[PDB]
Structure 1
Amino acid sequence: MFSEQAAQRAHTLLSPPSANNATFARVPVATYTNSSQPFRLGERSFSRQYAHIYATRLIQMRPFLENRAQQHWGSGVGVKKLCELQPEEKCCVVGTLFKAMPLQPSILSKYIHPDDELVLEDELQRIKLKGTIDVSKLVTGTVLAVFGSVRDDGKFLVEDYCFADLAPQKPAPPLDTDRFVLLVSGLGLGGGGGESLLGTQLLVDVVTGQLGDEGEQCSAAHVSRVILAGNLLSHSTQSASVEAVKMLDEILLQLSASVPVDVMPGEFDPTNYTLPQQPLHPCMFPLATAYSTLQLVTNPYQATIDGVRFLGTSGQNVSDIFRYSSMEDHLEILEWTLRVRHISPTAPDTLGCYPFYKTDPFIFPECPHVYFCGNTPSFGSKIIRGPEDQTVLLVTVPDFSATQTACLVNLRSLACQPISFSGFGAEDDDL
């Protein structure tokens, strides 16, 4: 990929001065299209209630689950509404989960408890559930189909159940010369060390073209874009924040000089709290708004970068699922989120969102080629396949303040390589 090509030449720099030194040029970004328009909210009227969201979620997700239960259990179909069930008869039900957990805090670290019930709910009534089903892997808000019978105590006995699955995916055109994309998250400007300072300096010095030989300068010239994904100012306590936006403005100036940059709000960043987070206001960045290479986005970000389509968050859905479930692997939680056809199924019950009423926008309408996450504690990447011809690369971006690691994504081979930065510390090997 990158470090293979970075040694492909001769080395000139352990030498006395010369007449000329080589220069290069940044590769063109001749196609780009932002398609994150359902997350940019222009009107923003509150004063509705959260019942309009669940109803449109069920009404939109129902035909997918009917069409999958047909070909997953046989076209001798027995799909039936929750009220028209007769005692001890084999049928399929399509509904919404609700997990009834105590230890979840009310108004007046994991939170799973050894006893907690699942309830299948439709628009008119509910029913309890027991049998062969996982009690702690599933969360409230997933829509699914299920197979079984109504027993004598009013409960329901489950044999097997199925999720919605992956959406269709059109193929991408192949590329001629490999272009790279760099992904960073969580610089933590405001607190978090001094080795993080030299790490941030060495990272911007490599990507801008100040560091290393003609190998590194030829290979960093091919990096086409830069994406910064959330949690730019890590905060120690709210009640500091004014002096940090000055330094963030300086860093975005030093990056806006050479590359195009995309900046996203995170868990602590001066924006709203609900989930389609709106872009940062330009009045906090005097210096960096001189150039038209800096762009400010928000939370759920879609794009079409050179044919390859991207979609990502700053890691607020994945940690929310991590709170109220039993899965630990963040790459697995990201793939599970992909499997139920919903970016954030736990919303709104433990993760706040805007009260939409026309259409729920967190249902996947297509399949992305790349799908990344936000502030995960360690690097990971994987390739997964669909039932049809659908392949997806899954990346979890590490957190720069502890690991000092970023990710390079190739746009022609579609692979991801880590990059790590480490200056020497107070290290003396004679003690």
Structure 2
Amino acid sequence: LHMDALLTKFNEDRSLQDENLSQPRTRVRIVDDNLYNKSNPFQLCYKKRSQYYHIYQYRLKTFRERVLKECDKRWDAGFTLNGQLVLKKDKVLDIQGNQPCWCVGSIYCEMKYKPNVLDEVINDTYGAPDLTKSYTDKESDEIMLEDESGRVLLVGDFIRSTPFITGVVVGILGMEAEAGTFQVLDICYPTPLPQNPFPATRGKIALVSGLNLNNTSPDRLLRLEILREFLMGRINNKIDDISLIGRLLICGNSVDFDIKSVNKDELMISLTEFSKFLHNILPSISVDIMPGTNDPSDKSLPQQPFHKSLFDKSLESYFNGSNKEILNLVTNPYEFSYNGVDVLAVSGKNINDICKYVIPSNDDDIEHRLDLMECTMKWQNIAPTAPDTLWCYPYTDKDPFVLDKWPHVYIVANQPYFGTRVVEIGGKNIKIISVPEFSSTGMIILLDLETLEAETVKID
């Protein structure tokens, strides 16, 4: 059929009912209890501002203690192997014999850098040497375990089908076969963290990221207007289903520019273009603003909120400090307690920086990102790569990036594709969700709060 036939079949059959416009349907109330309770974890003092080693030491000690507790809970005395008896070793140099043993120690790999980022950084240093020589001069692909007393080549098959990044603490237990190379039979992970109980009318949450509103791409504004109209219940017209979206969560990358050559005018134009959209969406559905890697904020991971400025003057009624449930500007990482459901969201700089390296082991697809997210959740360390992601003076004696309580849903954004994965670790349940960019394939993620079911909404 033609477009005229569909139009005559749809518009002529319009019901034109339920649009009273005087008694509208109220949106489902969804409150983030972490708004005013206490202990903003990623809120640092910019005025306060190497400490990386101090952080490394504390992280290594916490991880070692956790791994030791996990070994005591798993490899306790009397855990005999098939033929031989199992033993424990304190130093890495102590395991030498035809007997299995369990030990704790960090992992050390190659973790070479990508060539693209190499030239990308080289082109802006004013006379740097050929970094390609730094990798090609050496003769590579081997995993070793360092325990402050030596290194042993961890050869085996169970290590091949597992991802690893240098700096992780592992309590693997094996036995040497013919040289100073320890085999592997099982792999241990630190103790499971305590998780809040899942609560037993219910609403949904809209997550969108990768907007990248620039002065050159006009299709982004059209998609933004279409999304604003669809969330307002004007497109779908199913108020019974649209009113279940309590709030919208912008994860990051709302403005995209190259900080090398920008002026105040372009940023102001982009912020005022965003301000409109904001003024049209605010009085209908709440919004959660989060910064990103290309946003006008700090380039490190724990980014403070943008500012009270950088928005239209008509938004002063929302920045009065009293209407916070309608619009909430939060840091880059945050653990939102949406009606008792603890969900952690990150801008995605950690995974993007981990993928920025080329590891010559472990054998850019959706499964790879999901496995990396699962490993990040298991390792209880949000930032595995310290110097590329983290900044100086993150915290004193208590790192925030080390996980202390497992959440219900791990939300990551700024990814090329979309996907979900439900992982079970120590009887717990974690649902990892990969949010894609809104510029290219601007899909909208709808996350439910009753059954943790994520749905997608495409916009062309």
Q: Does 1:294 align with 2:323?
A: no
Q: Does 1:118 align with 2:146?
A: no
Structure 1: 5+ residue runs without aligned partners? 1-10, 423-431
Supply the distance in 1 between the matched residues of 2:350 and 2:16 (Cα, whole angstroms).
55
| Structure 1 residues 44 and 172, CA gap change in structure 2 (3 angstroms) | farther
Residue matched to 2:101: 91
Amino acid at match of 1:118: I
Supply the distance in 1 between the matched residues of 2:20 and 2:327 (Cα, whole angstroms).
32
Residue matched to 1:23: 24
Supply the distance in 2 between the matched residues of 1:368 and 1:415 (Cα, whole angstroms).
16
CA contact (8 A) 1:250 1:288 kept: no
Task: Select which of 162, 165, 190 maps to 1:164.
Answer: 190
Q: Does 1:180 align with 2:204?
A: yes
CA contact (8 A) 1:127 1:156 kept: no
Residue matched to 1:429: none
Q: Does 1:144 align with 2:175?
A: no
Supply the distance in 2 between the matched residues of 1:54 and 1:247 (Cα, whole angstroms).
43
Task: Select which of 291, 296, 299 maps to 1:265.
Answer: 291
Supply the distance in 2 between the matched residues of 1:129 and 1:249 (Cα, whole angstroms).
56
CA contact (8 A) 1:226 1:260 kept: yes
| Structure 1 residues 130 and 251, CA gap change in structure 2 (3 angstroms) | same
Supply the distance in 2 between the matched residues of 1:352 and 1:17 (Cα, whole angstroms).
55
Task: Select which of 28, 40, 43 maps to 1:40.
Answer: 43
| Structure 1 residues 227 and 102, CA gap change in structure 2 (3 angstroms) | closer
Supply the distance in 1 between the matched residues of 2:422 and 2:40 (Cα, whole angstroms).
28
SS at structure 2 position matched to 1:250: helix
Q: Percent identity?
A: 29
Residue matched to 2:458: 420
CA contact (8 A) 1:185 1:229 kept: yes
Which runs of structure 2 are paired with 1:334-345 in the superposition (5 Å)?
A: 334-345=373-384
Residue matched to 2:250: 228
Residue matched to 1:316: 349
CA contact (8 A) 1:144 1:163 kept: yes
| Structure 1 residues 284 and 102, CA gap change in structure 2 (3 angstroms) | closer
Supply the distance in 2 between the matched residues of 1:238 and 1:419 (Cα, whole angstroms).
35
| Structure 1 residues 407 and 50, CA gap change in structure 2 (3 angstroms) | same
Higher strand residue share = 1
Residue matched to 2:64: 62
| Structure 1 residues 79 and 254, CA gap change in structure 2 (3 angstroms) | farther
Residue matched to 1:238: 260
Task: Select which of 438, 441, 459 maps to 1:403.
Answer: 441
| Structure 1 residues 14 and 236, CA gap change in structure 2 (3 angstroms) | farther
Supply the distance in 2 between the matched residues of 1:141 and 1:341 (Cα, whole angstroms).
12
Which runs of structure 2 are paired with 1:9-20 in the superposition (5 Å)?
A: 14=14, 20=20
Higher helix residue share = 2
Residue matched to 2:6: none
SS at structure 2 position matched to 1:67: helix
SS at structure 2 position matched to 1:56: helix
| Structure 1 residues 19 and 203, CA gap change in structure 2 (3 angstroms) | closer
Structure 1 position 236, deviation (Å): 5.2
Q: Does 1:100 align with 2:110?
A: yes
Residue matched to 2:337: 304
Task: Select which of 268, 271, 277 maps to 1:251.
Answer: 277
Aligned length: 401
Structure 1 position 25, deviation (Å): 1.7
Amino acid at match of 2:24: T
Structure 2: 5+ residue runs without aligned partners? 1-10, 79-85, 123-127, 130-134
Task: Select which of 226, 236, 257 maps to 1:202.
Answer: 226
Supply the distance in 2 between the matched residues of 1:386 and 1:211 (Cα, whole angstroms).
41
Amino acid at match of 2:41: P
| Structure 1 residues 162 and 323, CA gap change in structure 2 (3 angstroms) | farther
| Structure 1 residues 287 and 120, CA gap change in structure 2 (3 angstroms) | farther
Structure 1 position 229, deviation (Å): 0.3
CA contact (8 A) 1:187 1:231 kept: yes
Structure 1 position 12, deviation (Å): 9.7
Q: What do you get for the CA RMSD once the two structures are aligned? A: 3.2
TM-score, with normalisation over the residues of structure 2?
0.78
**What per-residue deviation string (whole Å, max 9, x for no partner) do you get for residues 329-357 of structure 1?**
32222122112222121223x32333333
Residue matched to 2:407: 368
CA contact (8 A) 1:191 1:236 kept: no
Residue matched to 2:83: none
**What per-residue deviation string (whole Å, max 9, x for no partner) do you get for residues 268-303 of structure 1?**
111112221111111111333422222111211111
